[PDB]
């Protein structure tokens, strides 16, 4: 009766909460992947400029 | 740099997802408590009408 309508409403609200959780999870994963790429890019750029300076200090002596 | 802005944005989105999850959890608990009360009320009403009939069948014989 109003029990079965309310059971259906509880099931419908649980699905909405789960689907919204999944969309926010996908926003978080997307931003974290972009963050991971930028952190990697920063490590690579610092790595290269320190190594360039090591070669410049080696070429001054020769 | 844009790394720290993005770390803050990831932290802010995780808080929003958690707070929205909590509000939907409270809608589900609220509907489930109301469902529990109606199911209890239905069991009590069926219980009483069967017991009333048991007393009526006992009083017909006396």
* Partner-chain residue, chosen from B9, B14, B31, that has the shortest CB–CB distance to A13: B31
* Partner-chain residue, chosen from A21, A27, A35, that has the shortest CB–CB distance to B3: A35
* Other C-beta atoms lying within 10 Å of the C-beta of residue B24: 16
CA-based diameter of chain B, in Å?
92
Cβ–Cβ < 8 Å for B3, A42: yes
Q: The dihedral of CA B46, B52, B53, B58: what is its sign?
A: positive
Cβ–Cβ < 8 Å for B35, A3: yes
First-residue to last-residue Cα distance in chain A = 92
Kindly give, in sequence order, each residue whose CB lies less than 8 Å from that of residue A32, ignoring residues fewer than 6 positions away.
B10
What resolution does the deposited structure have, in angstroms? Answer: 2.2
* Contact (CB<8Å) B31/A38: no
* Contact (CB<8Å) A31/B13: yes
* Partner-chain residue, chosen from B9, B17, B38, that has the shortest CB–CB distance to A24: B17
Q: How was this structure determined?
A: X-ray
CA distance A43 to A38: 9
Cβ–Cβ < 8 Å for B17, A28: yes
Q: Which chain B residues are within 8 Å of A14, Cβ to Cβ?
A: 28
- Distances in whole angstroms, Cα of residue B19 to Cα of each of A24, A39, B54: 12, 28, 53
């Amino acid at each position: 009766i109003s029990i079965d309508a309310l059971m259906a409403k509880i099931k419908s609200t649980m699905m909405t909460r789960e689907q919204i959780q999944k969309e926010y999870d996908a926003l978080v994963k997307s931003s974290e992947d972009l963050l991971s790429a930028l952190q990697k890019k920063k490590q690579q750029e610092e790595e290269a400029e320190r190594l360039r300076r090591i070669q410049e200090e080696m070429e001054k002596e020769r």
